Design a protein around this ligand. Structure first.
Ligand SMILES: O=C(CCc1ccccc1)N(Cc1nc2ccccc2c(=O)[nH]1)Cc1cccs1
Ligand SMILES: [Zn+2]
Length: 204
């Protein structure tokens, strides 16, 4: 079963995670359509996800990757957002929920910019926004996103939309440029380390 560890605001770990989240906000091409208009989040809590089986499978895959990547995990901390957070923290990332016709195929997608991940909290293109107000820029409803350990191993660099089912032979991830999108094709190559609960904040 999943255990959530509550990080304290005065912990350096809490602070480093919020700072990564706050400092990687950027302007988006869609003018804020999907994720809303904001310059900063209000972080309500940050929780560390602890789950024995998810950790086991992550370690297990880590090893296989390292062997095919000159003994390097090539791990990176990256943001992920999607409507499936609650399932992810209990069951792990599941590539079976990926979509053909994703920009780089049926993978699980991660970003360096927290604001990119925030676009997907309510679905592709922000869906119809929060359940309560149908507002993709809702400043009331709480949102969650993940700050994850991602086993990239040997990344394939892609520069056009390609519909991949799996990383290319000898590879373990795809870094795609339509800003970079980090894509894995196996759920066990990501661990949902930090669960961040937050609101976007209305600019003054
Ligand atoms: O991840 C997917 C693919 C579908 C999916 C989602 C969760 C688990 C497994 C598959 N996403 C979300 C996502 N996409 C990104 C694209 C570029 C950069 C960052 C991100 C991001 O943070 N989230 C697509 C989605 C499809 C349906 C609902 S969200
Ligand atoms: Zn709302």
């Amino acid at each position: 079963g999943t255990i959530l560890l509550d990080l304290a605001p005065e912990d350096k770990e809490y602070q480093s995670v919020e700072e990564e989240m706050q400092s990687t906000i950027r302007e988006h091409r869609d003018g804020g359509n999907a994720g809303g208009i904001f310059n900063r989040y209000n972080v309500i809590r940050i929780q560390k996800v602890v789950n024995k089986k998810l950790r086991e499978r992550f370690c297990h895959r880590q090893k296989e990757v390292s062997e095919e990547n000159h003994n390097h995990h090539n791990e990176r901390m990256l943001f992920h957002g999607s409507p499936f957070i609650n399932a992810i923290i209990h069951k792990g990332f599941d590539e079976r929920h990926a979509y053909i016709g994703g920009m780089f195929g049926a993978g699980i997608y991660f970003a360096e910019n927290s604001s990119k991940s925030n676009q997907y909290v309510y679905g592709i293109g922000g869906g119809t926004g929060c359940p309560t107000h149908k507002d993709r820029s809702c400043y009331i409803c709480h949102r969650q996103m993940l700050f994850c350990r991602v086993t990239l191993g040997k990344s394939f660099l892609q520069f056009s939309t390609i519909k991949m089912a799996h990383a290319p032979p000898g590879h373990h991830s795809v870094i795609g440029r339509p800003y970079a999108e980090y894509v894995i094709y196996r759920g066990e190559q990501a661990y949902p380390e930090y669960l961040i609960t937050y609101q976007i904040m209305k600019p003054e």
